[PDB]
Amino acid sequence: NDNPLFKSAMVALSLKISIGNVVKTMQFEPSTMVYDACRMIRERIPEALAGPPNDFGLFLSDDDPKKGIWLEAGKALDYYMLRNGDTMEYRKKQRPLKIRMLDGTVKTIMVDDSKTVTDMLMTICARIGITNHDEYSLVRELMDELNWLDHGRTLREQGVEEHETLLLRRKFFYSDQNVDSRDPVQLNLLYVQARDDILNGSHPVSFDKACEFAGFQCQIQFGPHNEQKHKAGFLDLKDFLPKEYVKQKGERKIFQAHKNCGQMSEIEAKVRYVKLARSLKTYGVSFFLVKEKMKGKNKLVPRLLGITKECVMRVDEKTKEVIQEWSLTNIKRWAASPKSFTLDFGDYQDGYYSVQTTEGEQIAQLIAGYIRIILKKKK
Numbered sequence: 001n002d003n004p005l006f007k008s009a010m011v012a013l014s015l016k017i018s019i020g021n022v023v024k025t026m027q028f029e030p031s032t033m034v035y036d037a038c039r040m041i042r043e044r045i046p047e048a049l050a051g052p053p054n055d056f057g058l059f060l061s062d063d064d065p066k067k068g069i070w071l072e073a074g075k076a077l078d079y080y081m082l083r084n085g086d087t088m089e090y091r092k093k094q095r096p097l098k099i100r101m102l103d104g105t106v107k108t109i110m111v112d113d114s115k116t117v118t119d120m121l122m123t124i125c126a127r128i129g130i131t132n133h134d135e136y137s138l139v140r141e142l143m144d145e146l147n148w149l150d151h152g153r154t155l156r157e158q159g160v161e162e163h164e165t166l167l168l169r170r171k172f173f174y175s176d177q178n179v180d181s182r183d184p185v186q187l188n189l190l191y192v193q194a195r196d197d198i199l200n201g202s203h204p205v206s207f208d209k210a211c212e213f214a215g216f217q218c219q220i221q222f223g224p225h226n227e228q229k230h231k232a233g234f235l236d237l238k239d240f241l242p243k244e245y246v247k248q249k250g251e252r253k254i255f256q257a258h259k260n261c262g263q264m265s266e267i268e269a270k271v272r273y274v275k276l277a278r279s280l281k282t283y284g285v286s287f288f289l290v291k292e293k294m295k296g297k298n299k300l301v302p303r304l305l306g307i308t309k310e311c312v313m314r315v316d317e318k319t320k321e322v323i324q325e326w327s328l329t330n331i332k333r334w335a336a337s338p339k340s341f342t343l344d345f346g347d348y349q350d351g352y353y354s355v356q357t358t359e360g361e362q363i364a365q366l367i368a369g370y371i372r373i374i375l376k377k378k379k
Contacts, residue, residue, distance in 0.1 A: 016087040030078040059091040070114035098165040117151040191270040194277040214240040215257020219269040225258040290355035336360035
């Protein structure tokens with residue numbers, strides 16, 4: 001017997017439609033627009049009626065989740081180069097995104113799953129009443145160049161799946177930092193942030209400075225120095241010094257700084273800690289370890305590259321001395337790749353500054369972002 005349902009494989013698309021655990025194979029004219037394919041799916045699969053019809057769309061999955069894509073409603077199925085036997089998921093367009101708020105709690109926000117990180121950031125900010133979403137960014141919370149997210153790309157293509165909680169993070173503003181001793185709650189907040197940045201290496205400091213900081217830290221945690229209890233071996237130095245500086249010889253320098261605090265109060269040590277951090281040219285600067293080519297040396301030289309609202313700075317990796325600074329005004333153009341980052345200063349100097357780094361895109365976007373702010377104040 002013959003089959004009246006049969007159509008040549010060349011004139012129709014035979015697609016498996018997946019809705020949760022249900023799968024039905026369905027025949028489509030290949031020029032069918034995605035919106036109309038959803039209508040025909042609602043006419044054949046009862047689980048397609050599980051909500052308002054415009055809440056659902058079509059998603060092309062992939063064994064590599066980073067390659068899954070949402071289909072656009074106005075496009076024809078054959079635009080997506082589908083083949084007989086391919087599967088498309090009939091999926092809710094909005095999905096929950098778990099976000100750590102600025103108070104440390106996690107809030108689940110529904111976002112358009114086809115959109116970029118910037119789009120979902122705007123949705124988040126709209127839900128919690130933030131109008132200036134440009135003061136914020138989303139970051140991962142992995143145990144690190146790995147937590148950065150390109151806001152012009154999607155979470156999906158950057159390897160962030162739906163289970164992952166992201167952090168809403170306020171960008172650094174010097175204007176956020178005005179200190180005070182009458183507000184101990186705020187003073188503690190400023191102290192914890194300055195301390196954590198130094199201990200975790202975000203704020204690179206010299207060995208001598210690291211031990212002065214640790215001396216105030218000792219005053220704050222232990223009270224005035226007491227030679228009976230605060231003796232050799234007492235400190236767990238990993239909690240008082242940046243990782244690069246965790247060396248026994250640091251303890252005696254820390255105890256000297258601690259002793260020099262005398263009977264200074266907890267509040268006043270916090271003030272001094274914050275004041276010392278804010279006094280450094282490295283304070284507030286976003287740093288990247290990059291590899292420099294020195295004239296007359298084959299081995300590349302690691303260097304700290306710092307970006308701020310007004311300049312780019314080269315900082316010695318070991319002493320943290322500021323070696324060179326370029327005003328953002330005197331950069332002609334910049335370029336980033338997955339392996340390098342290069343600056344062109346026009347006629348301000350001969351030769352480009354070109355360094356090896358896997359964070360070039362991060363660096364480029366910081367510079368462009370700060371330059372955009374300077375642009376927006378003049379106009």
